[PDB]
A paper describes a structure:
Interleukin (IL)-38 is a cytokine that is produced by dying cells and limits inflammatory reactions. Accordingly, IL-38 was shown to suppress inflammatory reactions in human immune cells and various mouse models. 6 Particularly, IL-38 appears to play a role in limiting IL-17 production and IL-17-dependent chronic inflammatory reactions, with IL-17 concentrations being consistently increased in IL-38 deficient mice during inflammation.
It suggests that IL-38 acts on tumor-infiltrating γδ T cells to avoid an effective cytotoxic antitumor immune response.
Numbering used by the authors:
A (entry chain B): 2 to 211
B (entry chain A): 2 to 128, 131 to 136, 140 to 151
C (entry chain C): 2 to 145, 147 to 168, 175 to 227
């Protein structure tokens, strides 16, 4: 038994109509359920028995069958609908679909860009972490570059990106540049260089160790 | 549904309507309307009951949920349950209330519940299948396809 | 209706862990209990199911003979006994419930209507390690009249940690080349409020029984 889900990901604008398709590998199965999973949350049941709406789920969710093809439908996409959706064959060897990532498509929003020097505690510990912070932007793609004393850096940083917000539908990005205290103490100007679709020219936020 | 004496089937009444399910409720409907696709039914024998009464299990959804008779206030009650037909082939006392006696009346069949004797599968008069105590409304027909 | 999982943690390859699922608000006799797992960044995978009423059990092929599901109807508690663990068993483990009978009131097509919040399982020869917590201090470089402050929770193992604040940016933990995790938590706060209030993050890392309070003070 298999449940082939499509597409693996989509982005669509608020109010648009969204459908997701799940195709079962055997035709005697028709008890398909559909789940919504939000960041850090347990899955939540939307549709059961192929087309029945579960108590509480908004009326804009519906499900239908046509042969071995099962479809979830979101009639007017809302910002809170950002989630991964799974279909499920409910019996015996229970089977999920690979899942569909639903991103909300909004207008371009630029990042506010902030920077944090390392704290003193970490410096006494032997290492320096510089953090650069891009808040409440869209789309998710962004380039962030470190330049210590106008020397572009590589290998010694890592990035973290939130999930799409469920209210204003933006993202945030963190970039941590990790150095040893000695290396940190030898240089003066730490810069973070942000290029994004919302910025006409690349922005740079900087601080001097002094 | 690959076991000894294990076969696939579609179940019709005297008037060419087919067993199907909607949200767990067993109903009768036209196989040909796009509204009522019929249950693909696994049938398995219950080797521990009296073979001359043709004891069988009824598995909808290719054998993933089985039909049972449960004794309640309103009487005996049909119920579809999250039980696979191979677990019933293992046997035991608990498999009796998932067991139906396949009593032949000529070319058709009656389905009587072993846990609720004297009660038969009953087609609705008005357009849910139920249990009842020879009539065309208790007559059924098995086709492999 | 409530389902609570417990017993997750770090365990070496080939080791054993027992999980617990404590149910309330419904009867074990009228339902089935299920374990479903999810690896970081991956999809849902069913593990196992038990019918307390009939004592039937089912298992996904990838855990048969290693995992055993069971239930104690007296405690309304289901269990997953996991043996011969491997790294690919690393996942969050949910327990969930379904109503067995099509005639029951709250029947829902045998769909999983209630889930727990899940318990994390890490299979690894690595050792547990508490986190370091350093402040991300507001300054002029973090204001736009809103200020950003936060906590860098660095160098811990295994997941998870909880950060609590007494405008939130919940970044996911990153795995560092050292095989340790670090996350950053950010909060946005008005600039009226510095001096008026000191800000503290509570970092809770249960695996090492770490619990720290660092204050995030300006400049």
């Amino acid at each position: 038994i298999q449940m082939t889900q499509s597409p693996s990901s989509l982005s669509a604008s608020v109010g648009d109509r969204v459908t997701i398709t799940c195709r079962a590998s055997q035709s005697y199965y028709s008890y398909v359920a559909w789940y919504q999973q939000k960041p850090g949350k347990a899955p939540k049941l939307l549709i059961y028995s192929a087309s029945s709406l579960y108590s509480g789920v908004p009326s804009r969710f519906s499900g239908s069958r046509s042969g071995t093809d099962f479809t979830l439908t979101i009639s007017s996409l809302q910002p809170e609908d950002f989630a991964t959706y799974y279909c499920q064959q409910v019996f015996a060897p229970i089977t999920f679909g690979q899942g569909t990532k639903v991103e909300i498509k909004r207008t371009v929003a630029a990042p506010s860009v902030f920077i944090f020097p390392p704290s003193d505690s970490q410096l006494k510990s032997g290492t320096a972490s510089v953090v650069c912070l891009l808040n409440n932007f869209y789309p998710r793609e962004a380039k962030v570059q470190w330049k210590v004393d106008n020397a572009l850096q590589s290998g010694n940083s890592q990035e973290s990106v939130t999930e799409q917000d469920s209210k204003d539908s933006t993202y945030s990005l963190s970039s941590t540049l990790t150095l040893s205290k000695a290396d940190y103490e030898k240089h003066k100007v730490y810069a973070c260089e942000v290029t994004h679709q919302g910025l006409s020219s690349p922005v740079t936020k900087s601080f001097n160790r002094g | 549904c690959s076991l000894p004496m294990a076969r696939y089937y579609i179940i019709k009444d005297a008037h060419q309507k087919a067993l199907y399910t909607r949200n767990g409720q067993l109903l009768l409907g036209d196989p040909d309307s796009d509204n009522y696709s019929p249950e693909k039914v696994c049938i398995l024998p219950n080797r521990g009951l009296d073979r001359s009464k043709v004891p069988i299990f009824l598995g909808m959804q290719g054998g993933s949920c089985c039909l049972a008779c449960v004794k309640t206030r309103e009487g005996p009650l049909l119920q579809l349950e999250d039980v696979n037909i191979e677990d019933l082939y293992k046997g035991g006392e608990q498999t009796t209330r998932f067991t139906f006696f396949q009593r032949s009346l000529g070319s058709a069949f009656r389905l009587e519940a072993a846990a609720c004797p004297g009660w038969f599968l009953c087609g609705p008069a008005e357009p849910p299948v139920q249990l009842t105590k020879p009539s065309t409304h208790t007559e059924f027909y098995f086709e492999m396809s | 209706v409530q389902l609570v999982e417990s017993g997750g943690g770090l365990v070496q390859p080939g080791g054993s862990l027992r999980l617990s699922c404590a149910a309330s608000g419904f009867s074990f006799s009228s339902s089935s209990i299920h374990w479903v797992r999810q690896a970081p960044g991956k999809g849902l995978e069913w593990v196992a199911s038990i019918s307390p009423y009939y004592s039937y059990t089912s298992y996904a092929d990838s855990v048969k003979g290693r995992f055993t599901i069971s239930a104690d109807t007296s405690k309304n508690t289901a269990y997953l006994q996991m043996n011969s663990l491997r790294a690919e068993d690393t996942a969050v483990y949910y327990c969930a419930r379904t109503v067995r009978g099509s005639k029951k009131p709250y029947f829902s097509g045998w769909a999983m209507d209630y889930w727990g919040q899940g318990t994390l399982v890490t299979v690894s020869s690595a050792s547990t390690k508490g986190p370091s917590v350093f402040p991300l201090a507001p300054s002029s470089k973090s204001t736009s009249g809103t200020a950003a402050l936060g906590c860098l929770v660095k160098d811990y193992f295994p997941e998870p940690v909880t950060v609590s604040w007494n405008g939130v940016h919940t970044f996911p933990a990153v795995l560092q080349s050292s095989g340790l995790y670090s996350l950053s938590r950010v909060v946005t706060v008005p600039s009226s409020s510095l001096g008026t209030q000191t800000y503290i993050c509570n970092v809770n890392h249960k695996p090492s029984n770490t619990k720290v309070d660092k204050k995030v003070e300006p400049k």
